[model samples]
Target: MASVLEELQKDLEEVKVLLEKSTRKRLRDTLTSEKSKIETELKNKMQQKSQKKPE
Candidate 1:
């Protein structure tokens, strides 16, 4: 599940770069928020999954 989210984040980053190149503040801001949200979710999920096992 985290891998899926990671993959999505990667694709989103590509789009973000293109959006940045276009110099659209609105688009970039929207993408930034979405990317941050995805990253946060991914980090939390990864931490939860890792915590399931003892090291």
Candidate 2:
């Protein structure tokens, strides 16, 4: 799940770059927010998953 989210974030970042290149502020902003949300969610989930497993 974390890997999936990470990949999605990477893809979203690429879209963000493209949006910036095309001067699409609205799309860029939306993608940026989505990327941020995904990153936070991924981190949280990863931490929880790690904690749940015994090392």
Candidate 3:
């Protein structure tokens, strides 16, 4: 299976950039939460990758 770590990292950075440009509290709030979730999932994926492999 293809790993999504790179994609998640990219999305995290993009959201960070957008967070800087966000004017309203609503957009910032939503993106901020989304960023956190992405970060959390990325960490989990990293751990999962390290914990085992089919090799």
Residue 15 lDDT in candidate 3:
79
Give a tens-digit lDDT track for model 3, residues 1-55: 1357678878877777777777566666868689788978877776766757766
Q: Pick the candidate with the highest TM-score.
A: 3
Clashing pairs in 1: none
Check candidate 3 and list the clashing pairs: none
What is the alpha-carbon lDDT of model 2 when measured against the actual structure? 0.72
Deviating ranges (above 4 Å) for candidate 1: 2-24, 52-55
Q: Could you tell me every candidate's TM-score relative to the true structure?
A: 0.46, 0.44, 0.49
Question: Which residue runs does candidate 3 get wrong by more than 4 Å?
Answer: 1-5, 13-22, 52-55
Task: For residues 1-55, write the lDDT of model 1, one tens digit per residue.
Answer: 8687777778787767767786757676767777787777677777877646665
TM-score winner between 1 and 2, please give it: 1
Q: What lDDT does the true structure give each of the candidates?
A: 0.73, 0.72, 0.73
Q: What is the lDDT of candidate 3?
A: 0.73
lDDT of 2 by residue, 1-55 (tens): 7677778678777777767786846776766677687778666777876647675
